[PDB]
């Protein structure tokens, strides 16, 4: 699936969830690979420089839909600000939104090449993995990687109240709905934004359930993979499994903060229209 994001007024971006998880997986697979032995720690510069080049490349492809993106932003600003006939206008949103999704599909093979180049690099690093004793492989790399890349993110989650955040959003949608049922082009605009807000909410709860589930799993699993040794084949399986958990967690965390901002930007417009409608009585 593809997620459209409007974090601020005038900006519109997208994320292909499968590609993000995929890129994230091979990033953490790459870091686990070099942090296993003290000798390869210094390789972080090259790994950092390669991931930066993969990301800058993927973005250059995204930017090829920029003219089709900007043409959709112009239509959105018209829809959200009906101040200087809704069905004839709603077609301009659909077609341009479809033209934007269609542009992204037409660059599928181009994005797939970059993802496959990151898969190649990540796998080739993972293959350089070796132990001093194949029956007694150290887990210092797993511990270091987690402490330096994942633990801070696990804390930011535990600090913030995602379940409360969801309920505050649930309270906005329910307060908006009873006010909405007082209409006697503006009511049709309010109906559309409210609908888009319920869709954003459902994506926010979906990712929140992934964040909470993956946070618990990671805290439980990490205890079992550190402060002990594994046989080589077991250590390799552990590294591949942990990275999958990290990628799903980091993707949902990333999408949640973006959708959270998308919800409150659309709320600002909803409140301005409601405020205009109440003033005119």
């Amino acid at each position: 699936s593809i997620d459209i994001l409007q974090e601020k007024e005038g900006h519109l971006d997208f994320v292909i969830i499968p590609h993000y998880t995929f890129l994230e997986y091979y990033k953490h697979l790459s870091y686990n690979s070099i942090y296993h032995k003290s000798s390869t720690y210094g390789k972080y510069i090259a790994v950092d420089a390669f991931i930066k080049k993969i990301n800058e490349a993927y973005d250059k492809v995204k930017s090829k839909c920029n003219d089709i993106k900007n043409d959709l932003i112009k239509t959105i600003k018209k829809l959200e600000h009906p101040y200087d006939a809704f069905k004839k206008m709603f077609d301009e949103y659909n077609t341009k939104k479809n033209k934007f999704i269609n542009c992204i599909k037409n660059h599928e093979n181009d994005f797939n090449k970059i993802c496959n180049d990151m898969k190649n690099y990540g796998t080739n690093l993972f293959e350089q993995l070796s132990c001093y004793n194949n029956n007694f492989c150290n887990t210092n790399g797993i511990r270091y990687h987690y402490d330096e890349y994942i633990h801070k993110l696990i804390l930011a989650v535990k600090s913030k109240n995602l379940n409360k955040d969801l309920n505050d959003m649930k309270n906005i949608l329910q307060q908006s709905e009873k006010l909405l049922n007082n209409l006697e082009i503006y009511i049709d605009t309010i109906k559309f934004i409210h609908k888009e807000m319920k869709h954003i909410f459902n994506r926010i709860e979906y990712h929140t359930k992934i964040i909470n589930d993956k946070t618990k799993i990671i805290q439980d699993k990490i205890k079992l993979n550190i402060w002990r040794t594994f046989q080589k084949d077991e250590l390799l399986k552990k590294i591949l499994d942990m990275s999958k958990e990290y990628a799903l967690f980091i993707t949902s965390d990333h999408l949640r903060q973006m959708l959270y901002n998308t919800f409150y930007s659309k709320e600002k417009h909803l409140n301005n229209i409601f405020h205009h409608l109440i003033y005119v009585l």
Partner: antibody
Amino acid sequence: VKLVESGGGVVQPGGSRKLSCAASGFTFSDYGMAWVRQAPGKGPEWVTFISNMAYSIYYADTVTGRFTISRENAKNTLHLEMSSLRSEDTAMYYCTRAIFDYAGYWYFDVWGAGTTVTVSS
Amino acid sequence: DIVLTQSPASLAVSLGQRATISCRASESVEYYGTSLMQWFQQKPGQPPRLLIHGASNVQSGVPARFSGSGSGTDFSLNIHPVEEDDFAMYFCQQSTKVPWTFGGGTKLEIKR
């Protein structure tokens, strides 16, 4: 740091042959491995490649479906099973060690002395 | 497939001079800011010997008199000053796209 190929000789057309390469003076599992061949009076032709744990296996279009690369890491050995051999397969077959550069690429830094395969009736 | 064309096919030089060998790829050999061009040396009845790998990175143990330059599609091997040990065949090789291809070779010969 040495690579030594074995198994070369005269094979009849349509016949089969297995080549071996023994590695020494380094951790064999630390490297990608490849076979490169050189036809009499010609330049080198890359045949096949195998990554450290055999996750990547590549073949030149000239040998695909006829040749099979494999490695036995505990034995420090690289293998090449060749089948339905033709006169065009007559060459010096080299075993070469591949290094994965952190800029994201493979390069061949150590080569063996080679073993000749002559495909003739 | 990426075609590598070496120029000249044969080059004759005297001891102490500069030998410049050119390699031109049909497609770009760039891979995220790195040109994946290798240079090899080969003497009769001997295997190839790696000289340069990152279009520019001199192999450990390879004398400083060897250098590589270029990017994208145009590459150069420089030997300065040429010594007796250097008369051999030189091949460029790309590791950007499979099949990994070599050039046709340039023979470095002694002028007499």
